[PDB]
Write a protein that binds this ligand. Structure first.
Ligand SMILES: Nc1nc2c(ncn2[C@@H]2O[C@H](COP(=O)(O)OP(=O)(O)O)[C@@H](O)[C@H]2O)c(=O)[nH]1
Ligand SMILES: Nc1nc2c(ncn2[C@@H]2O[C@H](COP(=O)(O)OP(=O)(O)O)[C@@H](O)[C@H]2O)c(=O)[nH]1
Lengths: 429, 87, 429
């Protein structure tokens, strides 16, 4: 039971799953053909969450992939673990996004969405007990910014009780991958807070320095940057899929993580991170994992937790370790870092202990942070937004695709109404 | 700058009134819109020659006949059907 | 016992049997010579329904083939399974139809019918216990539109108690194979409702998209389109010919399917449909077969079941599966699709479970639908009829072969009296 339908969108949203589904299938011993090769019977205890069991003792990933051009979909099947997907789920257009939010939401998005929402529904009838949907996209491009949000506004009308979480890619602070990424941010962030229960923000820029200052990788390609995205997503659902002493799921990580229902922008962290030339000099102790998480250079977003206070902290643990030993460390970091947490919330640390470690290690963890340091992440977007919009710059493509100025004006102040909440809860007593 | 209008097909009623863009940058002739609409709609013959109004009263011939926020109907070799689509 | 005499007519009516009789003989292990090569003794339990057992331990198909020219009959014997037919049953003229209903019913039809009705009678004396006759033809051509209906009006006078069913080919909505197909439709549909107990309407146009959107065939020729016609006809008589737990026949599929005796136009469906590049990713479960039948793209006729209500639903199952498991699915689709069925009929779903699966698969089914969505199928014909007839267009060939205007006028309004019944029973309470 508790199945989760996985949905992807965008060029960034596809190639993450080519790394993500490689990691999940290797946690259960699955070849790229699709048969079984594991040794322990624990691996098939909760296999049905990401696998509909087909005939011939095969397994298919309950996954739907969306693009507006086939230039990326054929690149998935021609790589490793590309044979595992069912060929009926690749729903795609022919023209392309044009890196436009208006074309990703009104022009080509209205046509392709009916060929997706029946496929979700065809998986929904196959859901024995649906838990919620997860989405992987970006916020700066054309497809993952618009076509993902066009699904969410139609999914939430079909499923109000079901949870919803997006592993989006927030664009970098300083370097710019996309010219029109401030327009793609604000017009999509206005849609995220309407119909998403939580969001795990990932920056590109912070993942470079994690793979450079800590892993010391000489040539970090996408086969290693997206690997840390997969370690985050597998680090959340690892209590739903294996017997642990203290269970957790996306239901427990929603109400215990979001106390006010519009404040649901998170920050993930991963630990430990041993380099290939530095793994043989580190103590593998449980308090070693705590002091590596709570700094700045392990966050997966361009944020300064020294400027801001946390509200809810979820640390999902894997392996075999004492319950009292972890909770002493979680209490001690609340005492010494008393300025770093908010005053009016007791027991601001959530403990999740599983019993299956990641393959290749002995013990590990996964950090989920919720601080008011993301107000720098959005005001920097809104500062870039008001500079471009006051000149009516790059407006004759959005307006050329059926859009008015009042769409911008409500979406501009709603981000300002978002950040003004975070500053309000920052320094109260 | 663009037009927000929509089109259905006649006498069958499954259609949810898709709203294609109508703009000078995407269209430069009235007859061009009558043929670009054919891939997103189904008829008997498929000749989208005419389009009647919201109540099928008069014919259309120009882009300047397009007041905003109204529904049109697929026509051509057929006649108006008195369809209660928007009800 | 319970023999069925198979009659064919038309160029379309002949080449279907070249695919149809290939399928039936392969369900009992029969070479194109005509001997026996099977392994199980179950196959010869009801072999006498389509086979008169001749001397030398051979078997002949109880089949009669009719054309108005020998341009197709010699093409049957020069292919596979063309040696199996008796050379005395090929009764054919020499001139040709001319694609004319008047010449297919009055000019050449009066001559050839006496050389057929004795052959039916010569098979009728060989009938140990006659069940009924089945006919395969079209409705747009010359021979299958007229010469088939000229047999039915003479058969029904000879056999009022015997059942009668025609696997006709209703012409396509948009593309036109025949110029005079609205005249061939209405002048034959007036004759079908007089003396046929049921009719299974098959469109050409819907069978293209089944072989393209679902089977993903690159080059669909008639060796694969007529194969789905054979899977329909074998999917009905599979309870009459093999021991199942809950039997069925054409007698049970007549009164339980036609509640008002003039409303006997059906729509067939077939399931499952696995492509050669998609068969290794599908679960072979019993509720998988149900959700594949009840959509639009599996119907074998140009019909929209979303606009219209069903009246009688017959699903004939083959294989080994639980009785309670099927009936839970048949009850559930009545509950959720409550607008899709008529209100004043309880138990509108007929269950037929056999125990012999089709060869090459493990489990299968066959859908028989009876909805009020065929009123679009006939009003589109009658709209094409009144446009051609008001100009007296293409009338100087029918009138040139002994036909008056009053033949059209009664036949025009009888179709309007047919469709006005369907709209009357559509939205009552
Ligand atoms: N981490 C990561 N980011 C990627 C990858 N490919 C694209 N991106 C990011 O995706 C964003 C651009 O979105 P894009 O996929 O091109 O547009 P869309 O397909 O129209 O949604 C930028 O922020 C890129 O940094 C990848 O393989 N890994
Ligand atoms: N499915 C199918 N339809 C066929 C085939 N051959 C002819 N038809 C159909 O038969 C109709 C034309 O009838 P035809 O056989 O030429 O006339 P008749 O011999 O005088 O009755 C059209 O609707 C064709 O699509 C075939 O092999 N398969």
């Amino acid at each position: 039971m508790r199945e989760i339908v996985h949905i992807q969108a965008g060029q960034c949203g596809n190639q993450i799953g080519a790394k993500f589904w490689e990691v999940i299938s290797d946690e259960h011993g699955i070849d790229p053909t699709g048969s079984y090769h594991g040794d322990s019977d624990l691996q098939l205890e909760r296999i049905n969450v990401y696998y509909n069991e087909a005939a011939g003792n095969k397994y298919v990933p309950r996954a739907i992939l969306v693009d507006l051009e086939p230039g990326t979909m054929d690149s998935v099947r021609s790589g490793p673990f590309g044979q595992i997907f069912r060929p009926d789920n690749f729903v795609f257009g022919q023209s392309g996004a044009g890196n436009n939010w208006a074309k990703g939401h009104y022009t080509e998005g209205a046509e392709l969405v009916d060929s997706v929402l029946d496929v979700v529904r065809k998986e929904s009838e196959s859901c024995d007990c649906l838990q919620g949907f997860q989405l992987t996209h970006s916020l700066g491009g054309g497809t993952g910014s618009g076509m993902g949000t066009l699904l969410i506004s139609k999914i939430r009308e079909e499923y109000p009780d079901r949870i919803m979480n997006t592993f989006s890619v927030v664009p970098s602070p300083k370097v710019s991958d996309t010219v029109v990424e401030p327009y793609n941010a604000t017009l999509s962030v206005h849609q995220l807070v309407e119909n998403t229960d939580e969001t795990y923000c990932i920056d590109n820029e912070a993942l470079y320095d994690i793979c450079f200052r800590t892993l010391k990788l000489t040539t970090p390609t996408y086969g290693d940057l997206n690997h840390l995205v997969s370690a985050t997503m597998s680090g959340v659902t690892t209590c739903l899929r294996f017997p642990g002493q203290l269970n957790a799921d996306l239901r427990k990580l929603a109400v215990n993580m979001v106390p006010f229902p519009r404040l649901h922008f998170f920050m993930p962290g991963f630990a430990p991170l041993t380099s290939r030339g530095s793994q043989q000099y580190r103590a593998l102790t449980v308090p070693e994992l705590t002091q590596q998480m709570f700094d700045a250079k392990n966050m997966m977003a361009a944020c300064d937790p020294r400027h801001g206070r946390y509200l809810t902290v979820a640390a999902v643990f894997r392996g075999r370790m004492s319950m009292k030993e972890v909770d002493e460390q979680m209490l001690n970091v609340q005492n010494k870092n008393s300025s770093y947490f908010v005053e009016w919330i007791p027991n601001n640390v959530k403990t999740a202990v599983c019993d299956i470690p990641p393959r290749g290690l002995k013990m590990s963890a996964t950090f989920i942070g919720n601080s008011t340091a993301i107000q720098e992440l959005f005001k920097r977007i809104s500062e870039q937004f008001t500079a471009m919009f006051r000149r009516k710059a790059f407006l004759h493509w959005y307006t050329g695709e059926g859009m008015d100025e009042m769409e911008f004006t409500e979406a501009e102040s709603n981000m300002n109404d978002l950040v003004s909440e975070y500053q309000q809860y920052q320094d109260a007593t | 700058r663009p037009k927000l209008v929509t089109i259905i097909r006649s006498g069958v009623k499954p259609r949810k009134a898709v709203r294609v863009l109508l703009n000078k940058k995407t269209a430069h002739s009235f007859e061009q819109v009558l043929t670009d609409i054919t891939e997103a709609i189904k008829l008997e013959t498929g000749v989208v020659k005419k389009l009647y109004t919201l109540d099928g009263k008069q014919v259309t011939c120009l882009h300047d006949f397009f007041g905003d926020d109204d529904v049109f109907i697929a026509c051509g070799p057929e006649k108006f059907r008195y369809a209660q689509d928007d009800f």
